[PDB]
């Protein structure tokens, strides 16, 4: 319940952030946000085709983050750590407080166009679900 | 006088004026210029080593003077003495020496320097006059009489046989002249106590005698400041300098500079050696502008000098043209005309008579008085006559005489008579006799 | 400019380099007496003509070279050449400096 | 065989006081989505956080039903309330198991009937879903906790009269 | 023309970012004190796009003062800026650090 | 102007990252030490789009300095930055490398 | 500029090359006495006229050639030609350097 | 005097002045200029090899002098001796030798150098006078008498038959003159102990005799510093130099430089050879400006020189116009006029009489005294007469005589009489006799 601690768990995420040195060093605030224009590599982060929809409701229990990489920001960094742990675990699948995590059917897509002719950019979408709704 | 006092006097007086003449005579002082100089940072003038010192001089003087003396001296019509004894001697010679001495004495004083003559006793003891370069000591009189200077000393260094230089000073007394050699420097030449040697200027009776004449006093430059030397000399000094300068000038005073704005060669240590070896001067790059030498001023200088020389003669102002001459114009005055140079001298010569050269005769009379008679003036024997004259031209009378003899009796005596050479008609007689005898 | 700038300037920085360079050519040729263009001490002196050229060239060169001071990459730089300063020096405006 | 949810509620769940019976038909809305049970994990951050897909209930009614009015009053209060859920499947009165469940107070449009005996339908819906925020668990325990037993098992027999 | 300079000046450096904290924590260290001189392009003031920018990144010319620029903040005029674009002595008769570029390309995905 | 320059700081480069380790391992090498001269690109400063230019690339002219530019980190007086624009003797009396261009095609898919 | 720059400069780098080149033409023609333009030692000297041309040309050429120092590709480069410096040298501003 | 002492004296004195004259006489010293020079880095003047050394001189002197001597000598009216015996000899010749000797002696002293004459004994033992170039030794007197220098030595190197050079020194004594050859150098020529050879200057009685005259002392330049040579010489020295220079000048002092700013040809080693072969000089490229030669200075120099030459004559100085002459104007003075050159000399000649050339006569009298009688002065026999005169023009008298004879008796004696050539009318008589006889 606590309530105090639910904040704390959020704090834990904060703890993770501090815990993760490379985040500070790496960031890499640029490109994501303007600086897209800035020369390749430029890596921007954002949701894919995200425009607000639905009202009077939470957007979703799960939070999804979309990455678009040209120049490949720390997809690798996140991927290495996440992959290692995820592979490491690998299971059980995450469950929060008896809630059913599972996302629906996943999604995959990729397309790249390079005006520059720079090697093809890739897009990675990650979705996280925490707790049942 | 104490030696110290004696010595002191000389130093004060400035040696220069007599010395300068001597030096000048030997040569003009190029040094006075002496040479072109350069200005240092100090800006004090320094003589450059490069410039040479050159001087020439004449030496004009001698030729004229000798003529002057001879002409001036003439031959006395007669000579007389106050004393019979002296007179007898004086008549006979009559006195070659006397005339010469007087003329010389007057001449010397008149002539450079002199300036000052100090009598010294001859070995003979006959008055001998010598001239020594000025020390020059300042004249002072030990004796009360300010006007006279009883004693004057001159000290000059002399080179010995060894050639070591020692100071020598001479002590002069009115009564006696002294010569001192001060090798030691401690003492003057011995003694000299007094009349004993050095000898008095003159001694009479075989005993030391004093002239009683005021002791030698330096002569200030005359207001006239005219000298026999001077007359030519003024013209001459210019003349000599100019002539001398001209010859030197052409070669000289390049002298000798070569300057080029550009361009320098190898560093001059190398440069000098190579440059000589290469020889010739070439200009490259910028000019190449004409350099100092020889350059135009060789020509220019010659031109300038030529003008200068002409002027220089004019400065002499002897005269541009050769003599007309005004006379010659052969006449009695012709002779006067004949020697322009002499004539100027002649005026001086005549001047000398005015001078008291005649006065010297009086002096002789005084001398005459001194010996005796004592008290009379035999000096003039019932007359006083002086003749330059010269009344008669030698040529004219002689020429006339020859013609005259046939017409009538001439001269023979008449030409003679003026001297008279001889009263005796006898010489005349022979000429007549021949005529009677002839033929 | 700044002392640092002055120092940074090669010419200024190396007095010796600048000082040496001119006289090397200069010394041998000129008169060559040599017109010493030097004291007896041997302290260097520079000929008037040399001085004018040297002074201008030295000052110009450092400026021209840079750094500050160097032409802009973006376009060919009028300034560095200009106007042209090398040309300014050349045929220097009095002209054939000397007559 | 006694199958009856029973009706008694003063207000609190089960009413905490005996009443003559009323029935809720049955139903499970969902529980597909996560679905969020009481998650047990250690060192885990709860998520998604309390959200319910929804709830579903069917109700049946009898002449003596009470608190129908109360619900409307309840509606104004809008206080969160929960129900119990009874499956059938040999749900013995004492015996039958229960699910922890979820619901909403809010929706009760009306009650209807014909001649024979009143039926009401109530639907239960959680308001959501916020990405963050959870009870989560408590009403998840409660909202299948209330009606719907193991309750009133005895009164299932009752309403004889 | 400045001559010896600047004077007593203090520099602060910004390094590292803090993460995992709601707030951000930054640590700064002083830098050696040296003159810093920089010339604003202020853009050509063609500003054809004229959209941007303030040079991050103010292109700097500092005599023999490489150190202050980049990986440091130099306090001249008090103002604080971080530098990027390792030094370039385009100019400066003594080597001068310049800053090149402005962070983030304008072009955006 | 500059003359032989004393580069107290020697170029050090940072390359490669370590992964799979709780810690990270990095290797740095000093490519070499030398003075370098570079003019800021300072953008075209037509700034027609002016979204760019932010080095890389840089425009560097450094005499007789092969080493300085990339595949070697550029350090000037200890400042460190990495660059591109593989090297070119853009212009300098003694062979100087320069950098051309900007990284990443601005033109984007 | 920098020592390296000076060295990099071909003319500077090869003293010999620069030194040789002028005198080759120069030596034979000039007077030709020869006006040695050399010490006896044979240390080279340069004529004034030669010096002016040579000095300017040498300095200019290295600068002109580059590297730094070379015209910009992007546009035809005013600077390198300019203004034109070659032209500055040519008809050098005093004019017909000499009279 | 010890040999060492003797040797030492010479060295001190400066050889130069006598030597210079000798060298000068042979040639002027071009060396003095000597030539144009160049300045090294040192800047010390060095004479260039290229410049030649040229000098010319006259050699004016001889012509004038000889005339001077002849004129001066004249013929004595009569000669007399104190001693009867001497007188007898002296009357008869009367004394060609004596006059010549006196004239020569005086002449020599007057003439260059001399400067100093040192008597030496002749083989005959008759006084012979010779002049030797100055060593010159510094005169010092061994004897106490400072004034005289008893001994002076001069040592000059001589070339032998072998031509090997050995130093030779001569020892001079007042009493005797000594000649030493010091081949060994160890010793002077033997002995010479004393009177024995080298011989005394003069010996009397066949025994060595001493003049008692003060031993030869160098003559300082006279204040007059006038010489027979000098009179022309001053003019001449300029004259010769200018004349000599002029001829040389035109060709010379190019000399010879060719400088072109441009353009050099092939390297000069090749260049010189080829250039000569090609011949001609062409200019290409830049001028081409007139080179050092001919250049302007050919013209300029010509212009400059022309001015110089004109000045040059003046510098030597002479009457620009030829002689009027002032006289001729034929008269007695005409003769004086006739020789302008001689006339200047004549003044000197007359001066000589003033000089004590007459004094020499007195000296002769002294010599006369020396031999004897002892004690009288027979030197003047009842008269003293000297005649230059010259009273009579040869022409005029002769011309008159011819006419005269018819009219009356002439001369015959009269012209004679002055000498008198002969008393005897006889020569006259014949002329008359013919008239009486005629016809």
Tab-separated table of C-alpha atoms in Angstrom, chain B residues 192-401:
chain	number	residue	atom	x	y	z
B	192	UNK	CA	131.058	82.207	-14.194
B	193	UNK	CA	132.101	84.512	-11.435
B	194	UNK	CA	132.243	87.663	-13.454
B	195	UNK	CA	134.447	89.253	-16.050
B	196	UNK	CA	136.399	86.056	-16.303
B	197	UNK	CA	135.009	83.800	-18.954
B	198	UNK	CA	132.542	83.862	-20.336
B	199	UNK	CA	134.133	86.928	-21.833
B	200	UNK	CA	132.700	90.361	-21.806
B	201	UNK	CA	131.122	91.371	-25.069
B	202	UNK	CA	134.125	93.448	-25.896
B	203	UNK	CA	137.340	94.103	-24.094
B	204	UNK	CA	139.512	97.131	-24.492
B	205	UNK	CA	143.170	97.328	-23.689
B	206	UNK	CA	143.100	93.585	-23.508
B	207	UNK	CA	141.056	94.165	-20.418
B	208	UNK	CA	137.355	93.677	-20.229
B	209	UNK	CA	135.587	96.770	-21.394
B	210	UNK	CA	131.977	97.730	-21.233
B	211	UNK	CA	130.305	99.390	-24.148
B	212	UNK	CA	128.093	101.283	-21.799
B	213	UNK	CA	125.510	100.675	-24.438
B	214	UNK	CA	122.170	99.641	-23.112
B	215	UNK	CA	122.084	95.938	-22.982
B	216	UNK	CA	120.254	94.103	-25.667
B	217	UNK	CA	116.556	94.585	-25.411
B	218	UNK	CA	114.087	92.780	-27.508
B	219	UNK	CA	112.626	94.754	-30.331
B	220	UNK	CA	108.909	95.147	-30.487
B	221	UNK	CA	107.485	94.942	-33.933
B	222	UNK	CA	107.929	98.317	-35.488
B	223	UNK	CA	104.906	100.434	-36.122
B	224	UNK	CA	106.172	100.633	-39.637
B	225	UNK	CA	106.684	96.935	-39.287
B	226	UNK	CA	108.398	97.088	-42.612
B	227	UNK	CA	111.346	94.898	-43.342
B	228	UNK	CA	113.544	94.403	-46.320
B	229	UNK	CA	112.220	90.886	-46.267
B	230	UNK	CA	108.750	92.176	-45.820
B	231	UNK	CA	108.593	94.093	-49.038
B	232	UNK	CA	108.952	91.074	-51.241
B	233	UNK	CA	107.854	88.807	-48.494
B	234	UNK	CA	104.314	90.018	-48.382
B	235	UNK	CA	103.936	89.336	-52.057
B	236	UNK	CA	106.106	86.292	-51.781
B	237	UNK	CA	104.309	84.579	-48.976
B	238	UNK	CA	101.197	84.540	-51.004
B	239	UNK	CA	103.145	83.696	-54.104
B	240	UNK	CA	104.919	80.716	-52.659
B	241	UNK	CA	101.859	79.289	-51.016
B	242	UNK	CA	99.848	79.573	-54.160
B	243	UNK	CA	102.468	78.039	-56.400
B	244	UNK	CA	103.093	75.260	-53.966
B	245	UNK	CA	99.431	74.670	-53.403
B	246	UNK	CA	98.640	74.562	-57.064
B	247	UNK	CA	100.964	71.733	-57.893
B	248	UNK	CA	99.810	69.737	-54.928
B	249	UNK	CA	96.213	70.609	-55.482
B	250	UNK	CA	95.776	68.882	-58.784
B	251	UNK	CA	96.876	65.531	-57.494
B	252	UNK	CA	95.747	66.200	-53.990
B	253	UNK	CA	92.455	66.767	-52.223
B	254	UNK	CA	90.694	63.966	-53.908
B	255	UNK	CA	91.768	62.693	-51.602
B	256	UNK	CA	90.841	60.088	-52.241
B	257	UNK	CA	87.332	58.945	-51.679
B	258	UNK	CA	85.277	56.442	-53.564
B	259	UNK	CA	81.665	56.138	-52.619
B	260	UNK	CA	78.886	54.241	-54.265
B	261	UNK	CA	75.362	54.200	-53.003
B	262	UNK	CA	75.244	50.603	-54.059
B	263	UNK	CA	75.954	47.947	-54.155
B	264	UNK	CA	78.030	46.360	-51.472
B	265	UNK	CA	79.944	43.266	-52.393
B	266	UNK	CA	81.102	40.510	-50.127
B	267	UNK	CA	81.862	41.565	-46.602
B	268	UNK	CA	84.523	44.066	-46.899
B	269	UNK	CA	87.259	42.046	-45.332
B	270	UNK	CA	86.810	39.698	-48.224
B	271	UNK	CA	85.577	42.566	-50.293
B	272	UNK	CA	88.712	44.605	-50.213
B	273	UNK	CA	90.954	41.766	-51.180
B	274	UNK	CA	88.709	40.484	-53.897
B	275	UNK	CA	87.811	43.902	-55.144
B	276	UNK	CA	91.398	44.767	-55.776
B	277	UNK	CA	91.934	41.442	-57.426
B	278	UNK	CA	88.897	41.789	-59.607
B	279	UNK	CA	89.778	45.380	-60.255
B	280	UNK	CA	87.468	47.779	-61.991
B	281	UNK	CA	84.254	48.907	-60.429
B	282	UNK	CA	80.910	47.840	-61.743
B	283	UNK	CA	77.522	49.014	-60.660
B	284	UNK	CA	74.465	46.843	-60.614
B	285	UNK	CA	70.917	47.215	-59.476
B	286	UNK	CA	70.395	50.811	-58.561
B	287	UNK	CA	72.923	53.305	-59.751
B	288	UNK	CA	75.597	53.633	-60.224
B	289	UNK	CA	75.487	57.325	-59.589
B	290	UNK	CA	78.755	59.041	-60.245
B	291	UNK	CA	81.111	58.688	-57.366
B	292	UNK	CA	83.377	61.051	-55.535
B	293	UNK	CA	86.555	60.504	-57.439
B	294	UNK	CA	88.140	61.256	-59.584
B	295	UNK	CA	84.918	62.700	-60.805
B	296	UNK	CA	84.149	66.173	-62.024
B	297	UNK	CA	86.081	67.955	-59.319
B	298	UNK	CA	89.272	66.821	-60.898
B	299	UNK	CA	88.355	69.047	-63.798
B	300	UNK	CA	86.494	71.475	-61.622
B	301	UNK	CA	89.363	71.762	-59.227
B	302	UNK	CA	91.734	72.434	-62.040
B	303	UNK	CA	89.461	75.146	-63.291
B	304	UNK	CA	88.968	76.526	-59.830
B	305	UNK	CA	92.649	76.359	-59.128
B	306	UNK	CA	93.511	78.118	-62.325
B	307	UNK	CA	91.330	80.997	-61.295
B	308	UNK	CA	92.810	80.790	-57.866
B	309	UNK	CA	96.354	80.883	-59.116
B	310	UNK	CA	95.719	83.949	-61.186
B	311	UNK	CA	94.171	85.633	-58.210
B	312	UNK	CA	96.931	84.334	-56.040
B	313	UNK	CA	99.521	86.140	-58.090
B	314	UNK	CA	97.342	89.208	-57.910
B	315	UNK	CA	97.224	88.805	-54.189
B	316	UNK	CA	100.957	89.076	-54.528
B	317	UNK	CA	100.073	92.002	-56.699
B	318	UNK	CA	103.607	92.070	-57.909
B	319	UNK	CA	102.044	92.989	-61.221
B	320	UNK	CA	100.222	91.191	-63.978
B	321	UNK	CA	102.264	92.489	-66.835
B	322	UNK	CA	105.928	92.226	-67.549
B	323	UNK	CA	107.762	95.411	-67.034
B	324	UNK	CA	107.284	98.052	-69.664
B	325	UNK	CA	109.529	99.122	-68.187
B	326	UNK	CA	108.574	102.681	-67.512
B	327	UNK	CA	112.147	103.711	-67.971
B	328	UNK	CA	114.713	102.237	-70.284
B	329	UNK	CA	113.973	104.930	-71.394
B	330	UNK	CA	117.667	104.669	-70.885
B	331	UNK	CA	118.610	107.582	-68.718
B	332	UNK	CA	120.154	108.255	-65.382
B	333	UNK	CA	116.795	107.487	-63.870
B	334	UNK	CA	116.858	104.456	-66.093
B	335	UNK	CA	119.088	102.724	-63.625
B	336	UNK	CA	116.578	103.412	-60.917
B	337	UNK	CA	113.920	102.084	-63.222
B	338	UNK	CA	116.035	99.125	-64.107
B	339	UNK	CA	115.695	97.408	-60.807
B	340	UNK	CA	112.091	97.568	-59.793
B	341	UNK	CA	112.766	95.057	-57.088
B	342	UNK	CA	115.919	96.768	-56.032
B	343	UNK	CA	114.291	100.151	-56.123
B	344	UNK	CA	111.868	99.315	-53.376
B	345	UNK	CA	114.827	98.085	-51.429
B	346	UNK	CA	116.683	101.216	-52.367
B	347	UNK	CA	114.115	103.315	-50.632
B	348	UNK	CA	114.753	101.255	-47.560
B	349	UNK	CA	118.443	101.595	-48.176
B	350	UNK	CA	118.061	105.327	-48.392
B	351	UNK	CA	115.851	105.021	-45.381
B	352	UNK	CA	118.706	103.383	-43.556
B	353	UNK	CA	120.754	106.502	-43.999
B	354	UNK	CA	117.839	108.333	-42.468
B	355	UNK	CA	117.763	105.541	-39.943
B	356	UNK	CA	120.896	106.643	-38.240
B	357	UNK	CA	123.094	104.403	-40.231
B	358	UNK	CA	124.759	107.763	-40.451
B	359	UNK	CA	124.114	107.858	-36.750
B	360	UNK	CA	126.293	104.808	-36.553
B	361	UNK	CA	128.945	107.003	-38.057
B	362	UNK	CA	128.278	109.318	-35.179
B	363	UNK	CA	128.545	106.269	-32.989
B	364	UNK	CA	131.901	105.640	-34.573
B	365	UNK	CA	132.688	109.199	-33.720
B	366	UNK	CA	131.575	108.341	-30.227
B	367	UNK	CA	133.857	105.347	-30.327
B	368	UNK	CA	136.440	107.747	-31.541
B	369	UNK	CA	135.648	109.965	-28.608
B	370	UNK	CA	135.925	107.017	-26.311
B	371	UNK	CA	139.452	106.212	-27.287
B	372	UNK	CA	140.432	109.809	-26.931
B	373	UNK	CA	140.480	113.301	-28.345
B	374	UNK	CA	138.939	113.673	-26.036
B	375	UNK	CA	137.764	116.248	-26.457
B	376	UNK	CA	137.303	117.165	-30.073
B	377	UNK	CA	135.294	115.980	-33.002
B	378	UNK	CA	137.825	115.062	-35.598
B	379	UNK	CA	135.067	112.960	-37.063
B	380	UNK	CA	134.381	115.611	-39.603
B	381	UNK	CA	137.602	116.828	-41.060
B	382	UNK	CA	136.741	120.364	-42.038
B	383	UNK	CA	133.860	118.978	-44.030
B	384	UNK	CA	131.277	116.284	-44.017
B	385	UNK	CA	130.495	114.705	-47.321
B	386	UNK	CA	128.486	111.669	-48.211
B	387	UNK	CA	127.888	110.594	-51.745
B	388	UNK	CA	125.613	107.854	-52.882
B	389	UNK	CA	125.849	109.656	-55.172
B	390	UNK	CA	125.723	108.302	-57.660
B	391	UNK	CA	126.285	111.325	-59.804
B	392	UNK	CA	127.720	109.702	-62.831
B	393	UNK	CA	126.574	106.854	-64.952
B	394	UNK	CA	129.580	104.738	-65.670
B	395	UNK	CA	128.634	104.204	-69.259
B	396	UNK	CA	127.724	107.705	-70.201
B	397	UNK	CA	130.880	109.328	-68.993
B	398	UNK	CA	133.071	106.681	-70.490
B	399	UNK	CA	131.379	106.891	-73.829
B	400	UNK	CA	131.620	110.634	-73.838
B	401	UNK	CA	135.238	110.506	-72.863
